[PDB]
């Protein structure tokens, strides 16, 4: 699966490696897939508005071949939001996370599809 994040928080002084690593293991554990198949993308310094203000915020998308449903999505939202609160000071009230369950035939990896 892939967790693809954008934030207006500037990452120039941040240990992004630690954020990626925590997100990577957290997603693997909750979605129940080996971490070998987990991708995390984190774009910072992205202009954003949420609720009309430019205070720190984040937008994410999480794509997986199956494994996504109301319970898992709630648990992933809680856990990822806690990483963004602690490590980026993005409140969970300013984090939107879109989930997408893709068919394997519509997901490319290793030059082929699933």
């Amino acid at each position: 699966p892939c967790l693809n994040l954008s934030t207006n928080v500037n990452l120039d002084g941040v240990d992004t490696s630690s954020i990626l690593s925590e997100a990577s293991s957290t997603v693997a554990k909750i979605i129940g897939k080996p971490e070998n198949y987990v991708m995390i993308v984190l774009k910072g310094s992205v202009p954003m508005s949420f609720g009309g203000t430019e205070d720190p915020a984040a937008y994410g998308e999480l794509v997986s071949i199956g494994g996504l449903n109301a319970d898992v999505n709630k648990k992933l939202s809680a856990a990822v939001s806690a990483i963004l609160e602690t490590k980026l000071s993005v409140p969970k009230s300013r984090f939107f996370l879109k989930f997408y369950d893709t068919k394997g035939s519509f997901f490319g990896w290793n030059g082929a599809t699933l």
Copy 2:
């Protein structure tokens, strides 16, 4: 809802806050949701090609829990494309905008989902 935009235009010198504010209010009015729940994301200086050329262009995605249909989508495309033409000189013929309707159980906010 969230409108997530990328453009090859450089935002330096551009009043980025006014673009965000105009887009935020426009999306809120057309989709019919309080602006409290509208997110706008705008990345500039992104390498992109449209039609094989690198003239000003933009790609957007708009995600929402319902409220999307052919009529709403046409109105959103017209309004957002007008912002990009006037504020970034991105011609509407070089702007693609993918609309996605999501279930609330598949949209996270506030540490949970919108279910």
Copy 3:
């Protein structure tokens, strides 16, 4: 269609226009779409991890009004991954590509939508 890509590789160090042009031609030819309607987006220097490491990687999404199916998607995966291998040194084992078949009425262009008047085709 639009192919929208992110990578941790630094594009200051590569001819980015040649990647855009080769991807644009490749998507047009494999889906079978006029190149006038092909958009390629490429963001670089993006923090990423895949499998817990930060070696070169890429994430993409390809949206198209029709023209996508299991066979075409496999060909697109192979061809686009080969561009990133040769031009960005991103191994195909570190490249994920989501495909999405959209209705025209859910795809804005030219200040309206591409609402379809005939049948949709995979």
